[PDB]
Backbone as CSV, one residue per row, in Angstrom:
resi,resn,N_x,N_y,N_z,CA_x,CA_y,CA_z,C_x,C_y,C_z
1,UNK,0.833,-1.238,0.000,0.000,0.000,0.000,0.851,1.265,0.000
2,UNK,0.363,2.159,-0.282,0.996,3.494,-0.679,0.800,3.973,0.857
3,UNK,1.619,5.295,0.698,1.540,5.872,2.552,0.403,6.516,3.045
4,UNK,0.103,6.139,4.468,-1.232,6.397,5.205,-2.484,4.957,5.009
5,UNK,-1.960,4.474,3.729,-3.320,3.694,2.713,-3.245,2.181,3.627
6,UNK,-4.393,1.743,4.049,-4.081,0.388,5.086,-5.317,-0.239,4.591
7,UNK,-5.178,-1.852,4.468,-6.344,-2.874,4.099,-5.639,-3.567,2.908
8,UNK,-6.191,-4.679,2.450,-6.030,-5.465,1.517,-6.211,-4.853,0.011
9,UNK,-7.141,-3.699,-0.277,-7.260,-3.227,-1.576,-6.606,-1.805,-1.305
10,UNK,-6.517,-0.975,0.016,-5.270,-0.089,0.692,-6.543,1.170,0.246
11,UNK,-7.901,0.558,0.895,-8.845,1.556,0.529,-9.090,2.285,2.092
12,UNK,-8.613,1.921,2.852,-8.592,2.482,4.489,-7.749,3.448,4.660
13,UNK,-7.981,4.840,4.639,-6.954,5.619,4.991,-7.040,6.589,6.784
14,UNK,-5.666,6.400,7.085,-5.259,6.820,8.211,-3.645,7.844,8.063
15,UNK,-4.161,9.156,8.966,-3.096,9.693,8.751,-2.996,10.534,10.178
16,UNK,-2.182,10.208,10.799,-1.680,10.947,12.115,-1.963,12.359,12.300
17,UNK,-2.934,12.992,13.733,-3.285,14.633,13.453,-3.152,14.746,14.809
18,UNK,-2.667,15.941,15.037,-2.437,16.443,16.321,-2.804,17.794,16.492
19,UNK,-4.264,18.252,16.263,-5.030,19.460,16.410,-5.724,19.454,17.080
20,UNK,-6.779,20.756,17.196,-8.476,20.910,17.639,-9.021,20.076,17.293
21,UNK,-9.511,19.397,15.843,-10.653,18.583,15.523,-9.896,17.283,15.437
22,UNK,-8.821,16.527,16.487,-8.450,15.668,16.583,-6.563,15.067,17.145
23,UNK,-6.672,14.549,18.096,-5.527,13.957,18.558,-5.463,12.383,18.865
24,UNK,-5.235,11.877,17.862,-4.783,10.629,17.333,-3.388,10.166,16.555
25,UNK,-2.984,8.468,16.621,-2.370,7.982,16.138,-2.859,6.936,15.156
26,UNK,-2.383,5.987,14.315,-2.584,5.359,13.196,-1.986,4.049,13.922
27,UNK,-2.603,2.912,13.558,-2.683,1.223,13.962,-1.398,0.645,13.175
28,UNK,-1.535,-0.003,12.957,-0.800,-1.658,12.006,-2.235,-1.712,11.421
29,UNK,-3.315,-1.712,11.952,-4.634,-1.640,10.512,-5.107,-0.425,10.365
30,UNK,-4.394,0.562,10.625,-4.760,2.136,10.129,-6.166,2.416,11.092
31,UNK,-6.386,2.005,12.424,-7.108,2.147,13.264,-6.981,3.486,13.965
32,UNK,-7.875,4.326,14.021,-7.796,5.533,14.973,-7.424,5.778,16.393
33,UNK,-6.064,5.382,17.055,-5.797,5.621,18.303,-5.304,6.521,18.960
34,UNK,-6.731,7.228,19.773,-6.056,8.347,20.256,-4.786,8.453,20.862
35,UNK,-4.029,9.904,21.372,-3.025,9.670,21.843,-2.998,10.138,23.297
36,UNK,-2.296,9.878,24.047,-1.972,9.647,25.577,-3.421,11.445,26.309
37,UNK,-4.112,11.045,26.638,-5.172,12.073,27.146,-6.096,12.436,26.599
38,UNK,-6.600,11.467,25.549,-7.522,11.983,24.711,-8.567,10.766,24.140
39,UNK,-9.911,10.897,24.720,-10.718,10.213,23.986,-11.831,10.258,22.571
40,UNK,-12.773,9.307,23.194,-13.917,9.862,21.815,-13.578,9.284,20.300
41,UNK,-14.385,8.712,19.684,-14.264,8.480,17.887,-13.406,9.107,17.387
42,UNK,-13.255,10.765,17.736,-12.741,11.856,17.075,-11.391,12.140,17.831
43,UNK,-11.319,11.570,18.959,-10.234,11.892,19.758,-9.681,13.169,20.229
44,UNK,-11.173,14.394,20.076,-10.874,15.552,20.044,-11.616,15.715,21.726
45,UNK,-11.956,15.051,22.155,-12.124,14.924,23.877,-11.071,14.396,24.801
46,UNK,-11.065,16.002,26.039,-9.785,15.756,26.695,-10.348,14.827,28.028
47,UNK,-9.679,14.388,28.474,-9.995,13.012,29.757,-9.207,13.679,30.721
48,UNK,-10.267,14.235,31.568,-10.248,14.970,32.615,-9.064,14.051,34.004
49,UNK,-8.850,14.593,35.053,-8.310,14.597,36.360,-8.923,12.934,36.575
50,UNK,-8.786,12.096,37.242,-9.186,11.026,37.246,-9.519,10.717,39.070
51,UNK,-11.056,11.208,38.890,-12.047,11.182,39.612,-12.721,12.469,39.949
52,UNK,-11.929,13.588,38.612,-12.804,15.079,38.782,-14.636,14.812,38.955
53,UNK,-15.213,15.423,39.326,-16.469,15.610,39.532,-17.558,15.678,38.145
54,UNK,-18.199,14.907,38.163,-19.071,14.962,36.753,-20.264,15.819,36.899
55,UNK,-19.672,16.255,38.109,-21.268,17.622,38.785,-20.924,18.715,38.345
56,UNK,-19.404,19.023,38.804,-19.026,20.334,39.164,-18.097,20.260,38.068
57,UNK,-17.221,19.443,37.835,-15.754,19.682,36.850,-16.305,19.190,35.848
58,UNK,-14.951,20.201,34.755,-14.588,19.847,33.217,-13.524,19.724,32.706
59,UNK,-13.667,19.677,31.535,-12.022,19.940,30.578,-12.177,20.106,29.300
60,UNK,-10.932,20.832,29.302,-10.526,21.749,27.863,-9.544,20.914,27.190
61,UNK,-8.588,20.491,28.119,-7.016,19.875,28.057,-6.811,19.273,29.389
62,UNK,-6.442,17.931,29.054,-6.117,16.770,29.730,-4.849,16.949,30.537
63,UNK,-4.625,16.377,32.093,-5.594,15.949,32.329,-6.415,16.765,33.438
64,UNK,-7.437,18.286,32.743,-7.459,19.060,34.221,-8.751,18.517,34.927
65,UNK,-9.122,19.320,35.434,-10.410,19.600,36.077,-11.042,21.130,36.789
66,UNK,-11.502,22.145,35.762,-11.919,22.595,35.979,-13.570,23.206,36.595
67,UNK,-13.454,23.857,37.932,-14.479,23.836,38.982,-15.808,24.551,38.550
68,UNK,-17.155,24.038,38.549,-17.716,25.215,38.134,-17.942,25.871,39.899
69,UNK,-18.588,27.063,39.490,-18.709,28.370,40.510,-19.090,28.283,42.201
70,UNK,-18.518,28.367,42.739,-18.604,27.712,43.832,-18.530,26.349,44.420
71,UNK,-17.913,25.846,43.710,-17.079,24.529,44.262,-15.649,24.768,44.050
72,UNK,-14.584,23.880,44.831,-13.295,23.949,44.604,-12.542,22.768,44.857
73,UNK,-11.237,23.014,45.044,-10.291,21.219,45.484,-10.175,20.622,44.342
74,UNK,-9.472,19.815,44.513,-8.322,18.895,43.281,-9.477,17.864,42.254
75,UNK,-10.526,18.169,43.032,-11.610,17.076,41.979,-12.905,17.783,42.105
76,UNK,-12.866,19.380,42.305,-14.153,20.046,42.514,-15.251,19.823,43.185
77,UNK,-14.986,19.158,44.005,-16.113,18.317,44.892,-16.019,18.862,46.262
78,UNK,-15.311,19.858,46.371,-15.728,20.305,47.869,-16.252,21.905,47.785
79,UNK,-17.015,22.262,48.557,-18.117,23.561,48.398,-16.876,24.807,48.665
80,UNK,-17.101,26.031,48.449,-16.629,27.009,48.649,-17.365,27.375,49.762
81,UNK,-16.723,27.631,50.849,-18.038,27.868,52.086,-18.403,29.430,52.393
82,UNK,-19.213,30.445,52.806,-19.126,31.805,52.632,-18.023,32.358,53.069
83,UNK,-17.660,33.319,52.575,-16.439,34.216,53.133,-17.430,35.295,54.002
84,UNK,-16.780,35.620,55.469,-15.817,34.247,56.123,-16.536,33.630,56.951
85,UNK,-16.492,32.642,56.777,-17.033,31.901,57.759,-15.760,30.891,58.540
86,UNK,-15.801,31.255,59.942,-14.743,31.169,60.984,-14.681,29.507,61.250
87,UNK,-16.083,29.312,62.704,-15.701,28.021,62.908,-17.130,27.040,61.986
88,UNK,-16.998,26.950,60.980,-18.008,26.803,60.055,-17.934,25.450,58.914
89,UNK,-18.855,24.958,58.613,-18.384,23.954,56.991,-19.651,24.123,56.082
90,UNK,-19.302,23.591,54.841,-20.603,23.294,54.104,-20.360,22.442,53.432
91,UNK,-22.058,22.526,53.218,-22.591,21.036,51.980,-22.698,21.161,50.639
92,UNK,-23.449,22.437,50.893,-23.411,23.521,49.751,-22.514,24.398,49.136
93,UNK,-22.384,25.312,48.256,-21.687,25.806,48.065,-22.599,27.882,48.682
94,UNK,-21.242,28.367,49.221,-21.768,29.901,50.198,-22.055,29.494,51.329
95,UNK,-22.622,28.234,51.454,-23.143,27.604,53.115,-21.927,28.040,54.182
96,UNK,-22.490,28.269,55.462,-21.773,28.484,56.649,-22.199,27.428,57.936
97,UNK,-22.191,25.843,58.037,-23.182,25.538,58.943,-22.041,25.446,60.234
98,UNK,-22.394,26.197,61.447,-21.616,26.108,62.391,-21.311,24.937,63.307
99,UNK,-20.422,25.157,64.069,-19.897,23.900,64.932,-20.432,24.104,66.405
100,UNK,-19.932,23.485,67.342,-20.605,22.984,68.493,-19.114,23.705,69.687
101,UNK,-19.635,24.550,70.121,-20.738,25.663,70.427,-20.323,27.130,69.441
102,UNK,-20.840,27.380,68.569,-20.502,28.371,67.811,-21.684,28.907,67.188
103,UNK,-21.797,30.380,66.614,-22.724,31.104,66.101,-22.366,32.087,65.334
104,UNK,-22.591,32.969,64.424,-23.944,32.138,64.016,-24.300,32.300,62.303
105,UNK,-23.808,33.847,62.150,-24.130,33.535,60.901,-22.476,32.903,59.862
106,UNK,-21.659,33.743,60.624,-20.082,33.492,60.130,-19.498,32.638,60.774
107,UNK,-20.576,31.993,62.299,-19.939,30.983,63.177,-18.572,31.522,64.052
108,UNK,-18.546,32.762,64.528,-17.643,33.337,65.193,-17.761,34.056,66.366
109,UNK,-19.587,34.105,66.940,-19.578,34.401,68.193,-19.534,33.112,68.622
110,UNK,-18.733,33.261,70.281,-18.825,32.304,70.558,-20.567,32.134,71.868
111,UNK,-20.793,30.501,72.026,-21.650,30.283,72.320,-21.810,29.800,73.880
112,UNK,-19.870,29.985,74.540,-19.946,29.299,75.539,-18.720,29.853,75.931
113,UNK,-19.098,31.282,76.035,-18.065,32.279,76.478,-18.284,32.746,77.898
114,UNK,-18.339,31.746,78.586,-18.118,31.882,79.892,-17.555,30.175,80.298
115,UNK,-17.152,29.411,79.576,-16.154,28.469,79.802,-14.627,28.995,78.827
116,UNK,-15.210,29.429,78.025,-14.396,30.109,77.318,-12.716,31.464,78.030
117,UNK,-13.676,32.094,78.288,-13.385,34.084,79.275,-13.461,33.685,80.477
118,UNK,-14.216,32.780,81.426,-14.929,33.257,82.493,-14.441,34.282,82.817
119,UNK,-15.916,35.130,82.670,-15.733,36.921,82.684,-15.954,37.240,84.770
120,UNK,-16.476,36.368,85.523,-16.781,37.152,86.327,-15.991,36.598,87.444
121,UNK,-15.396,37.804,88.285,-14.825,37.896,89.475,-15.464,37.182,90.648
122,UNK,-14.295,37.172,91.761,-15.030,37.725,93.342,-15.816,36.053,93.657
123,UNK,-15.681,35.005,92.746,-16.502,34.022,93.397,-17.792,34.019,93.011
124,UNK,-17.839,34.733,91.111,-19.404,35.056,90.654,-19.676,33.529,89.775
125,UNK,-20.569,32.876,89.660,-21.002,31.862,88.770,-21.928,32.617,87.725
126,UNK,-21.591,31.811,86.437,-21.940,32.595,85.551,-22.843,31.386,84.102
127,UNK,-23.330,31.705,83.498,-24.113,31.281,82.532,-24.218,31.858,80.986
128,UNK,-24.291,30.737,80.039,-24.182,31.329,78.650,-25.742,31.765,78.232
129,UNK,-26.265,33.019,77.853,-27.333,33.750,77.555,-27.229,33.985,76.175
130,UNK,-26.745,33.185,75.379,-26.517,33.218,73.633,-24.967,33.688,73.238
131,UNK,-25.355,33.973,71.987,-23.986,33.836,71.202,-22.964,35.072,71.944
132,UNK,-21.876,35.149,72.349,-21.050,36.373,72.538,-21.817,37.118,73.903
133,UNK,-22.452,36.407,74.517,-23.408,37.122,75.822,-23.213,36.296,77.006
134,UNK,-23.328,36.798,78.179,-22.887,35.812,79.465,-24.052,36.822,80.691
135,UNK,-23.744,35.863,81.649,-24.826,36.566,83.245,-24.230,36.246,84.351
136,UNK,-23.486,37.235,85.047,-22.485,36.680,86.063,-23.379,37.205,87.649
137,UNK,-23.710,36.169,88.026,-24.046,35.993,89.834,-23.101,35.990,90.914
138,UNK,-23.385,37.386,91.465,-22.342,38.140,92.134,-22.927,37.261,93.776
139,UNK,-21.786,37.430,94.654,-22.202,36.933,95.842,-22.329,38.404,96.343
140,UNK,-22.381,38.655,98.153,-22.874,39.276,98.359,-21.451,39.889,98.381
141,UNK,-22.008,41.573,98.527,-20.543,42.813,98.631,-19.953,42.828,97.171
142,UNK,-20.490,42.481,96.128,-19.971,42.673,95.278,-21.183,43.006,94.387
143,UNK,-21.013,44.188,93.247,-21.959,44.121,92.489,-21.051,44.182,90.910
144,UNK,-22.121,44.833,89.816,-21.376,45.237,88.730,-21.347,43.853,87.611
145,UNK,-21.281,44.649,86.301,-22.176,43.224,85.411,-20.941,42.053,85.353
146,UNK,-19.667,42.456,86.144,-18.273,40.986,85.763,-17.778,40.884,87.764
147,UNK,-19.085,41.813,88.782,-18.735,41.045,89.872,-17.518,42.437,90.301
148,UNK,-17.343,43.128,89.805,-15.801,43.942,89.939,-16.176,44.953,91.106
149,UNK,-17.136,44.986,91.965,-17.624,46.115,92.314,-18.507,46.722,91.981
């Protein structure tokens, strides 16, 4: 057969391309084999990160994985969580869901800021009244909202 020309009457033609509308090699039977990152008939599909996200990731050129919008990480599968969110995670992507004891919307007051600070003097016992808030019980001879007098 003449060059590229493959088959018994050398009516099969194959010829090596390394572009946009194709990245392939040529057989021993002039078979279309793509080359190292590239699938598809046409071989013009790049084969992404290997286990990128078929939710969130894509590709242009092998082997990436690019994130769509609000997801991130090496296989796009983990959420972007709101900025900022302190002691916080998500499921979602912008989500802030806080931790234990934390609040509330950025997860940065705290919720147990009187094990935290204990704010009050003098022998005062004290209690958490919500996020970043406390109630200190003064004994007697002492007053003032931390017991100080």
């Amino acid at each position: 057969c003449d060059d590229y020309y493959y088959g018994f009457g050398c009516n099969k033609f194959c010829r090596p391309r390394d572009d946009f509308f194709g990245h392939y090699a040529c057989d021993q039977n002039g078979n279309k084999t793509c080359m190292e990152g590239w699938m598809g008939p046409e071989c013009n599909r790049a084969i992404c990160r290997q286990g990128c996200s078929p939710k969130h990731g894509s590709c242009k050129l092998p082997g990436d994985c690019r994130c769509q919008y609000g997801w991130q990480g090496l296989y796009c599968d983990k959420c972007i969580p709101h900025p900022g969110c302190v002691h916080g995670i998500c499921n979602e992507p912008w989500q802030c869901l806080c931790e234990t004891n934390w609040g509330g919307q950025l997860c940065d007051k705290d919720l147990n800021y009187c094990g935290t600070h204990q704010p009050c003097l003098n022998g005062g016992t004290c209690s958490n009244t919500g996020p970043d808030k406390y109630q200190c019980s003064c004994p007697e001879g002492y007053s003032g909202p931390n017991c100080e007098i």
